[PDB]
Subunit: 117 residues, 4 copies
């Protein structure tokens, strides 16, 4: 019953991207981004436990993935500052969201898998 | 031009036409000051955003209005938009092409930077 | 200890791609593709149990994913006949391979995550 | 031309230059008969593979020699190559651009088909 999971993979090494910082924000009624949760990717490149079913109410959310630090630490100066995912959540009732990102120094892809528990 | 944006549609196998694109420059106060905008052409390209003089070093944001594009096609989208944030010109002036490949629940962006 | 897993996701629906046929082949000493394993993706879009550590000897392998049937069944005539992954395996000792594919009607991406148990 | 192939490098943020590409047509016996080939240009493009007359309906294979490209750059690659298999012209003649974005452990291909 974790309703939000983020998973990050490295397209160069063919590996999970470990220790990647992730910050999650929620758009406020006044229209600004309130901090909602944060964490770092595990060995498996996954970040669990960000939120709960109750807390994770309808809204617009932003997941910012600190790809730049991940590359810089490997000696690489990447193109992007970060990878950002912005989406409306739970608009038709609660769902479970997996936000997956695949990283290369000059490219990233992002895909959402959304399921109905 | 020093900056071009090009958008493709993975569902139809075509350029993504009439997609709104906004470009911003990060301000001293860490706000985004809007800088240039346009809509992609019938080839999915947006040219003429900026000039070599104007396009000085800094951190830039390209915001692509993916949601409106999908809505227009009658297809439900996941993302609000697709954003590309990058530092420009850090080693000199370059020509940047920002390319995006769009699916309703996924997108991929790549930069082709040539000097 | 499953050394080969294939995972397929649908970029249109934001879902696993279920019931996707997958065929695996191994290049023979005579240079032709011998059938090695086959299966279909589960509800979670994953296919496990293709092979074993002992069977999965060094070689060149091909994973063919029947994307066309997956789309056609949804009413869609897709661009690709299939998605094929060809790779050398276990060249430096045994590894565990996850072959992931993300599908759209006119595009697919494939990524390998390779780990050392 | 009715068929173009374009290859980009996600590691360097550049066109992938001097990449070998082979094109095949499926034969009656379900073998691949090699049809056209080339190497990508400094812009990552390969033009001139075929002509409208020659490019009749059928099933075609495009094989991109990704492995050699990475080897040349000194980077270890996962794939032997990247293949694109598709049926051409089923609704009429079209112009096909096959685009590939390459990373050492990943690739993505997309078709832009215009009539
Ligand atoms: O290995 C991958 C690659 C990743 C991915 C592919 C494409 C994309 O656009 C974004 C992420 O997809 C995945 C999604 C998963 O749930 C688990 C995975 O192991 C993987
Ligand atoms: O930079 C890119 C990436 C590429 C692409 C992205 C995703 C994918 O899955 C396959 C190809 O598309 C392009 C197509 C072009 O005409 C010019 C380009 O610069 C690009
Ligand atoms: Ca400059
Ligand atoms: Ca024809």
């Amino acid at each position: 019953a974790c309703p939000l999971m983020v998973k990050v993979l490295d397209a160069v090494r063919g590996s999970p991207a470990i220790n990647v910082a992730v910050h999650v924000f929620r758009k406020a009624a006044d229209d600004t981004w309130e901090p909602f949760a944060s964490g770092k990717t595990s060995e498996s490149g996954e970040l669990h436990g960000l939120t709960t079913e109750e807390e994770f109410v309808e809204g617009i959310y932003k997941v910012e993935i600190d790809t730049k630090s991940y590359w810089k630490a490997l000696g690489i100066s990447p193109f992007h500052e970060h990878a950002e995912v912005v989406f409306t959540a739970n608009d038709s009732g609660p769902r479970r969201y997996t936000i997956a990102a695949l990283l290369s120094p000059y490219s990233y892809s992002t895909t959402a898998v959304v399921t109905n528990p």
